[PDB]
Chains A and B, each alone.
Chain A
Amino acid sequence: ASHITKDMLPGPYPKTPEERAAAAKKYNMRVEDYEPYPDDGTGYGDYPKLPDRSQQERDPWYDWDHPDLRLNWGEPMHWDLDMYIRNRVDTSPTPVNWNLMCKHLFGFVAFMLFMFWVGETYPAYQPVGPKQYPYNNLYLE
């Protein structure tokens, strides 16, 4: 039976400094880069004061993270930003954006034109004219 600030309310400018943290301590003293200003853009059905989104994100990734359990497994107290998309997702590796795989898949895009050609073994190419003579022209005798 917790009624005092039991959820978010119609924010985000009903004295937003008195939101964090009279309750729902997402910010310490409303200057922590996590004061409840980040109502994305409102008007929609997004989050209001919402101890919620655009706080620092893209991974809880089960780090070394020893000062508490605190990464994803072992319940830090009150730091909820977003959930249900992160038990299977990660941070940035050493390479960067470069979509070389479509260029890597473009290696057969040159040979996709080679799929129109034929594959007879003998004789050799001699690609100069109609002297190759593929099929039957004349009769037996």
Chain B
Amino acid sequence: LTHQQKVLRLYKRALRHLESWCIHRDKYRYFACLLRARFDEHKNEKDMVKATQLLREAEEEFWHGQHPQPYIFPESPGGTSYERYECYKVPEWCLDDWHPSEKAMYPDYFAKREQWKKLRRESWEREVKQLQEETPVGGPRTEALPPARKQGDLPPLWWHIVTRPRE
């Protein structure tokens, strides 16, 4: 993380912590531009300690008095009912063993199920042809070419390209 974008990680949560405490909507909305004037103290300057002392005093009065049980937007890392839908929980590929008269239903769905597998069954003449080439030695985050230079299939095929939908 860099020093300039360290301002941005605080700036969104500076106002996000405030609407936890408000009672109206305009009461929170009146303090948006009102807090903006403090942000408009040093508009554009150098990147040295003058920009760090604006953040070094943003240690206090940001963590100091921070969010007394705030809003959480319940579908989140925290919050209630964040992972509540777990009786279903999307068991993708639980459907290998059937021993049919249980595979009687959905006839066209299984006919398409084996169809997509040939896209995964034939990708390593193309994906592994660039997997040895795109990585220089052992370097950074290893996504492929996002078109794979002819046809990107996927590169992340198929557990990510057919990833779990929510309900």
Binding site for B on A (CB under 8 A): 62-64, 67, 94
Contact = CB atoms under 8 A, between A and B. Distances in A.
B151 interface: no
A94 B63 contact: yes
Contacts, number: 7
A64 B77 CA distance: 6
B77 A94 contact: no
B126 interface: no
The 7 closest A-B pairs by CB, nearest first: A64-B77, A94-B66, A63-B77, A94-B63, A94-B67, A62-B77, A67-B141
Interface in B62-88: 63, 66-67, 77
Nearest to A94: B66
Which interface class (under 10, 10 to 19, 20 to 34, 35 or more) fits B? under 10
Nearest to B83: A62
B60 to A, nearest CB: 13
Contacts of B63: 94
A41 B73 CA distance: 46
7 contacts: A62-B77, A63-B77, A64-B77, A67-B141, A94-B63, A94-B66, A94-B67
A63 B67 CA distance: 19
Nearest to B67: A94
Residue among B63, B66, B67, B77 having the largest count of chain A Cβ atoms under 10 Å = B77
A122 B25 CA distance: 54
Contacts of A64: 77
A53 B68 CA distance: 34
Interface string B123-167: 000000000000000000100000000000000000000000000
B138 to A, nearest CB: 11
A63 B77 CA distance: 7
Contacts of B77: 62-64
Residue among A62, A63, A94 having the largest count of chain B Cβ atoms under 10 Å = A94
Contacts of A67: 141
A67 B66 CA distance: 27
A64 B141 CA distance: 18
A38 to B, nearest CB: 26
B140 to A, nearest CB: 11
A94 B66 CA distance: 7
Nearest to A62: B77
Contacts of B67: 94
A139 to B, nearest CB: 67
A26 B66 CA distance: 36
Contacts of A63: 77
